[PDB]
Amino acid sequence: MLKIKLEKTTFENAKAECSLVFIINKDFSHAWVKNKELLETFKYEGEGVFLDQENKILYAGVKEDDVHLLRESACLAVRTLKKLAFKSVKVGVYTCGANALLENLKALFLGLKLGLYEYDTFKSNKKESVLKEAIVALELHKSLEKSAKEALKYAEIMTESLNIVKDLVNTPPMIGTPVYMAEVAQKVAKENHLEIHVHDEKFLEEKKMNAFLAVNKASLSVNPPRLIHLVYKPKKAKKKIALVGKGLTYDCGGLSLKPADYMVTMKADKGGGSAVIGLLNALAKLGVEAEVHGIIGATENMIGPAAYKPDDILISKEGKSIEVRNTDAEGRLVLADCLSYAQDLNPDVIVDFATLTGACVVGLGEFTSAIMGHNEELKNLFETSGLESGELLAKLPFNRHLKKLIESKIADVCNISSSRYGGAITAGLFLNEFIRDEFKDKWLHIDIAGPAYVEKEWDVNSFGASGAGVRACTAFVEELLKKA
Amino acid sequence: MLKIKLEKTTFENAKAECSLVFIINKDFSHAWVKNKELLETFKYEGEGVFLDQENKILYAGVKEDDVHLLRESACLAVRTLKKLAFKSVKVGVYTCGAALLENLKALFLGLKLGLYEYDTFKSNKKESVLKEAIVALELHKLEKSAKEALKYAEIMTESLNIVKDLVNTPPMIGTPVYMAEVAQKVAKENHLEIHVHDEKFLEEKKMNAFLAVNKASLSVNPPRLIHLVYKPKKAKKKIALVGKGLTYDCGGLSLKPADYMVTMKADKGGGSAVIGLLNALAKLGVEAEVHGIIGATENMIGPAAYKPDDILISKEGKSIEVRNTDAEGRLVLADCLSYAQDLNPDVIVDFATLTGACVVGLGEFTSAIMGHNEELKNLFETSGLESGELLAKLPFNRHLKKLIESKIADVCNISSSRYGGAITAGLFLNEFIRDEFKDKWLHIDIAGPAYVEKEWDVNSFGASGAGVRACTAFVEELLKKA
Amino acid sequence: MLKIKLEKTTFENAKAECSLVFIINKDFSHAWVKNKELLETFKYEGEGVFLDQENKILYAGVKEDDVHLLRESACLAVRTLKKLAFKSVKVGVYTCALLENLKALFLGLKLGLYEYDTFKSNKKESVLKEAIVALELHKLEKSAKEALKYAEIMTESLNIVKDLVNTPPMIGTPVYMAEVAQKVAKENHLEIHVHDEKFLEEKKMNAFLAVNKASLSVNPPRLIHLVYKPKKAKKKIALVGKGLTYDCGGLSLKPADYMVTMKADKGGGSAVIGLLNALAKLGVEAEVHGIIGATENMIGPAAYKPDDILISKEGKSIEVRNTDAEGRLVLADCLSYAQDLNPDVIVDFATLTGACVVGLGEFTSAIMGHNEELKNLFETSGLESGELLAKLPFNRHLKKLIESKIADVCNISSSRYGGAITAGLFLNEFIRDEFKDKWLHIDIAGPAYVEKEWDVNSFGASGAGVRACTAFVEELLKKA
Ligand SMILES: CC(C)C[C@H](NC(=O)[C@@H](O)[C@H](N)Cc1ccccc1)C(=O)O
Ligand SMILES: CC(C)C[C@H](NC(=O)[C@@H](O)[C@H](N)Cc1ccccc1)C(=O)O
Ligand SMILES: CC(C)C[C@H](NC(=O)[C@@H](O)[C@H](N)Cc1ccccc1)C(=O)O
Ligand code: NA
Ligand code: NA
Ligand code: NA
Ligand SMILES: [Zn+2]
Ligand SMILES: [Zn+2]
Ligand SMILES: [Zn+2]
Ligand SMILES: [Zn+2]
Ligand SMILES: [Zn+2]
Ligand SMILES: [Zn+2]
């Protein structure tokens, strides 16, 4: 954890073992640029970072006056400083293109804190960084104390929440079992004084969640499944909100086995479920005025003599029958039954998160999540809020032609499309078949298969897990409640 | 089971139901070529074998004056006679380009290996009428040399055939437990110390890389860590031989295609060779303390299988990012090499059917030698080649070493590149060799010649016993200098 | 280019706009480390480079006390300074034998400026133009100028090869290759013959012609023959290079993943052109012939085919089963041409097999042949010159794998294993008995072109083969 200290003082009078100065749009004119000549001599033009050794100033370029760009640079700066021997760094308050001040303060604070994270638990050479603190001089680069206090609280809560999700998603599958997911949820419940229910395969059987159970059949005797149900219930609740996540702690494809090149990183198939656990932590600690339910269907999708099969026809909890033609479309089966369980809560809003389809990633790229559903106003609110939080998102539209592609000749619906095209969307349309008529205008489906796990550093994300979904959904709920 | 009888007599005065005469480099001039006109009449030009029916003489061609080609020809000759009705064959003593002792070993070994074939499951299996080769101690171009060569031939034939029978055993039968049983027999035969450890011992020693490979099949065929010890009255060196005993390798969750999974019963080639080596080295009575270490397990697929993305803590302590479960042998070896080093040996050699890339690079008939110590690598190569095995050194370099980095562990069990697989596998093993052992270590990748689906040289279809002769010759030459 | 000035002065007294200091094996004790505590403060421990801003000193780490790593670091140091605004750098003399170290430093430094950035719009001229070498030992003048001459010639020669190999295939045609060879011949006053398809027809080089058939009417083939003939020649040496200016695999078409980078299939032929330039400028005492068979291997309605049976110039017939084994067909005929010259030594260079790259990795070339002494000489000399090499052994089992039921030999192996070696054994079929002990085959499929920076090589072409064959020829002549 990078500690951030707010101090009522000029940047110049603040004390720290080094300084951080951002260069926005190649503007080197500010008083905080102490030795402009050194930068010219070594040809620093505001791209990436540059360290003035004599003055111990780290400059960090921000290409455009942009909050999103600010968050990224602040992260890079701390990553850079993490490998050095300075115990502390001081920085002033910036106000880039975004109200604006608060969002700029949030981006600076979160960015800085996120620069310390890397999944290095298993590396033998790992070092504790010397860098422990950032001193924030409450002075404008261009009430401030109140807004900085508000942004620091957000940054503290969101960093913790993001890092919970990332440590879990990054956890290797021999360790990160469904039972392990439940234990992480149990800690979060105890920390936040939440209600938690952890159900097993017998509960699933009693509730007739046979789609969920089918996916688990191969591995039941090794790693039994867990239906994790977290509840945050404050004194004033303006809305009941259900967050449903795909908790696939390992997806090998089942009998429809994945090729080796595609099976690697599937420890991250619990990205959605993990994001939901982090969301209950964030929303509880932010004390939002809503009753929030976190529902995670956790299981592996393994191969073995008891595995569910292409040609199986499963009776969903909702009652509809499902022709299985490919066991590698397992997430939507777990989700079919978890969404059904969710609707039994009679929520006002349902949002599911899932690393659901490769086709989403092909369509949007690795860095962007897809938003699906019927209510355009609701989808727009999630998109607008999520983009502001710094996540990349795109709506994908249903249509009636795609809907026909998941027809089955021998069941009510097929777990794959008859076409090679439109996979993210036909998957969302599969889920729709399990959304009751009275919840169709209250449901969002978010496919985070891309950004939940990426094998390189990008933006505020280190190699591996990113915590995709958490910032966007938090922003969406806050904006939702502001209107209620 | 081909008895060789040495006789103080001329080739002509020796008695047997038929004769074997080698034709070297198409030279038909020798007195032993009894009816030359017959060979002309039927266009025998010294390629392969030809049987003079009236004189009951089998001619066997040796294309060049070469001791290796003589070994091969002797094998082919007996293979030919095995199918006939002569109980005995007589042969003289030959001396091709090598020397006398080397040539006698070639002849006697070649002849004995001619009888071997894996026909255990054939319903039309026939026992051979051919039982003996009478060797007339007369030079084509001694008794002390012949005796010494016969001893080697007898021990090496037995040793190679132990290994070949084990490697050829199909996987339903040839389990890790089965390997341990064969090791027990060899230990009992040679009065060796033997330890057979199970998964509980593996857990105690934190050999989690080894354990991970076995997890899919633990409840079906549990793993075995086999440890043989030969300890002579005089021991000039302490030598640890480490073998990959993968009794089946389906690739795990990173499942092999069907065309590539067939023959993987032979993924126990390296561990099997180590078992045969303890037999050979004990009976030869070499002046070295020899440890044979075999990590035996299957690599199966199932709901408890270890996975791409698993990160395993090796016994040595280094963490391993698994990105492909079909790179399993190097995990088992990482832990078996750690166990080996705790013995503080002077020399460590490992044998493994480890990479397809080795076979692509060298061909199916040649094993790769890797390591740091050039004198030690050269000694294995020269000794090995002299013993009749085909070998090649493959060099490490710093560029290949970077390719097994991991972003989230100390090392990755696969390379980032499609190129140089045999050598990056070697460099993976290197990460588990302590500094104080790096100049005492050889890695031998026998993925090619350990199992080949045709007859070649002195090798029948299937298992060849690769690594046994070469490592024997290496140890003998090593003890000469000590 | 990077000018190197040798100056008889101390490192301290030498003048340049910045300094270069090597840190060998994390030894920071030397006088030239001007401000130690700065390195401590910023956790520089001698890996990669570090720039002392105040003193304008670039430190470059050398992990071990090794001449090869010195070569590498020197290159990295200059790549680093190239992006900066200093016009000159000064460096002392290092010894990680003295001649060998001086050659590595000077070559290393000069190779630091090479990038294939011809088609980049943002390319800007470098400020860095000179390295001032203070003739003072870290731990001489005659060795320095000897190493400087080598470095200058070898940098020129390597960059000739890399520019050519890097040239994209629409431009880098067989005619274009012959043009680069014409420039090298004119520069060095060499004898040069450039033959076309009519000459190939007359010489019955039908294996070569077959590969060219698809694209004859677009880019005709060229047989390039350079001759260096000095006043004193102790040996006659033929250097034979595969000049496939593009290899799409022909009818046996390559998938997209594998076709990209095949502009570099002229790696071997390009290496031979650079060799002739190096060996002539070094004035070695040997008559050296450089023979390059240049053509594309394209697909089209006139393409040669799997099932074609070709009559080589040597006379042996070849069953084609895969048109993507085209290099060995060009080489079969070029080797025949080479042997007619009655050389004492023949070395061929070719980016010939993927199997070689699979077996050895991308950074190492394979050496094949019969004469162990000749192979050991090439290997040892090449390793000292800074190239990574391995010998691959023939054997009789592999030789059987290229038999044909309907021709004298097949242009592919019947097995998926041992491809670099069975390719060598295919070439062997066209080497006369009287040349078999005078022949080396070098498969540079790996390091001739690599899509990243490594050692002294920038992205793309490396100039593989040139340094090693130069060192081998120089060492060969010592024995004569
Ligand atoms: C078989 C298809 C109909 C469905 C299939 N979906 C899956 O395999 C999901 O279970 C995968 N978990 C989807 C995924 C892909 C890439 C990165 C993260 C997650 C897909 O390929 O999209
Ligand atoms: C996944 C790859 C990085 C490693 C993989 N290696 C293996 O599958 C080994 O376990 C095989 N047992 C190696 C082998 C290949 C061919 C013949 C005999 C033995 C290989 O393909 O070489
Ligand atoms: C068809 C095979 C017998 C031969 C085939 N060889 C070729 O395609 C050569 O013409 C290629 N030019 C060899 C090559 C491969 C990879 C990188 C650099 C160079 C090969 O794949 O090795
Ligand atoms: Na992803
Ligand atoms: Na094999
Ligand atoms: Na290459
Ligand atoms: Zn799946
Ligand atoms: Zn999945
Ligand atoms: Zn394997
Ligand atoms: Zn294996
Ligand atoms: Zn080709
Ligand atoms: Zn080619």
mmCIF file of N, CA and C and ligand atoms in Angstrom, chain A residues 246 251 258 266 269 326 328 330 332 355-358 416 449, ligand 1:
data_model
loop_
_atom_site.group_PDB
_atom_site.id
_atom_site.type_symbol
_atom_site.label_atom_id
_atom_site.label_comp_id
_atom_site.label_asym_id
_atom_site.label_seq_id
_atom_site.Cartn_x
_atom_site.Cartn_y
_atom_site.Cartn_z
ATOM 1 N N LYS A 246 -19.613 -14.936 -13.045
ATOM 2 C CA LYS A 246 -19.084 -16.233 -13.472
ATOM 3 C C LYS A 246 -17.821 -16.535 -12.668
ATOM 4 N N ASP A 251 -11.178 -23.215 -16.537
ATOM 5 C CA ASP A 251 -11.945 -23.639 -17.695
ATOM 6 C C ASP A 251 -11.013 -24.350 -18.671
ATOM 7 N N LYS A 258 -10.040 -27.360 -24.789
ATOM 8 C CA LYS A 258 -9.335 -26.230 -25.412
ATOM 9 C C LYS A 258 -7.959 -26.639 -25.904
ATOM 10 N N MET A 266 -6.653 -19.440 -18.373
ATOM 11 C CA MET A 266 -8.021 -19.733 -17.951
ATOM 12 C C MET A 266 -8.214 -19.816 -16.425
ATOM 13 N N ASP A 269 -10.818 -17.248 -15.600
ATOM 14 C CA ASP A 269 -12.218 -17.410 -15.940
ATOM 15 C C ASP A 269 -13.122 -17.151 -14.730
ATOM 16 N N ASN A 326 -21.509 -28.089 -27.135
ATOM 17 C CA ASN A 326 -20.093 -27.802 -26.918
ATOM 18 C C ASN A 326 -19.887 -27.464 -25.454
ATOM 19 N N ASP A 328 -17.493 -26.296 -23.960
ATOM 20 C CA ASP A 328 -16.685 -25.099 -23.745
ATOM 21 C C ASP A 328 -17.562 -23.828 -23.694
ATOM 22 N N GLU A 330 -19.655 -23.186 -21.192
ATOM 23 C CA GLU A 330 -20.092 -23.582 -19.854
ATOM 24 C C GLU A 330 -20.529 -22.398 -18.986
ATOM 25 N N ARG A 332 -22.241 -19.795 -19.570
ATOM 26 C CA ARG A 332 -23.614 -19.347 -19.731
ATOM 27 C C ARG A 332 -24.565 -20.323 -19.024
ATOM 28 N N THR A 355 -16.314 -13.408 -17.968
ATOM 29 C CA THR A 355 -15.344 -13.629 -19.021
ATOM 30 C C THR A 355 -15.984 -14.698 -19.925
ATOM 31 N N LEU A 356 -16.953 -14.289 -20.746
ATOM 32 C CA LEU A 356 -17.870 -15.251 -21.357
ATOM 33 C C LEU A 356 -17.479 -15.759 -22.741
ATOM 34 N N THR A 357 -17.028 -14.874 -23.627
ATOM 35 C CA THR A 357 -16.776 -15.293 -25.012
ATOM 36 C C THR A 357 -15.472 -14.766 -25.619
ATOM 37 N N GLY A 358 -14.807 -15.616 -26.398
ATOM 38 C CA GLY A 358 -13.675 -15.183 -27.203
ATOM 39 C C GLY A 358 -14.092 -14.188 -28.280
ATOM 40 N N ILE A 416 -24.873 -23.261 -27.836
ATOM 41 C CA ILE A 416 -24.043 -22.533 -28.803
ATOM 42 C C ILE A 416 -24.868 -22.041 -29.987
ATOM 43 N N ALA A 449 -14.383 -10.650 -20.926
ATOM 44 C CA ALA A 449 -13.389 -11.658 -21.326
ATOM 45 C C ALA A 449 -12.056 -11.037 -21.756
HETATM 46 C C1 LIG D 1 -17.405 -22.450 -27.600
HETATM 47 C C2 LIG D 1 -17.950 -21.071 -27.799
HETATM 48 C C3 LIG D 1 -19.409 -21.155 -28.281
HETATM 49 C C4 LIG D 1 -17.929 -20.291 -26.490
HETATM 50 C C5 LIG D 1 -16.448 -20.003 -26.052
HETATM 51 N N1 LIG D 1 -16.493 -19.449 -24.728
HETATM 52 C C6 LIG D 1 -15.576 -19.967 -23.684
HETATM 53 O O1 LIG D 1 -14.752 -20.855 -23.955
HETATM 54 C C7 LIG D 1 -15.632 -19.354 -22.264
HETATM 55 O O2 LIG D 1 -15.988 -20.278 -21.313
HETATM 56 C C8 LIG D 1 -14.237 -18.757 -21.990
HETATM 57 N N2 LIG D 1 -14.081 -18.570 -20.601
HETATM 58 C C9 LIG D 1 -14.246 -17.448 -22.772
HETATM 59 C C10 LIG D 1 -12.893 -16.570 -22.712
HETATM 60 C C11 LIG D 1 -12.172 -16.352 -23.890
HETATM 61 C C12 LIG D 1 -11.004 -15.576 -23.875
HETATM 62 C C13 LIG D 1 -10.570 -15.020 -22.688
HETATM 63 C C14 LIG D 1 -11.285 -15.226 -21.503
HETATM 64 C C15 LIG D 1 -12.462 -16.003 -21.520
HETATM 65 C C16 LIG D 1 -15.797 -19.089 -26.965
HETATM 66 O O3 LIG D 1 -14.879 -19.505 -27.687
HETATM 67 O O4 LIG D 1 -16.124 -17.922 -27.040
#
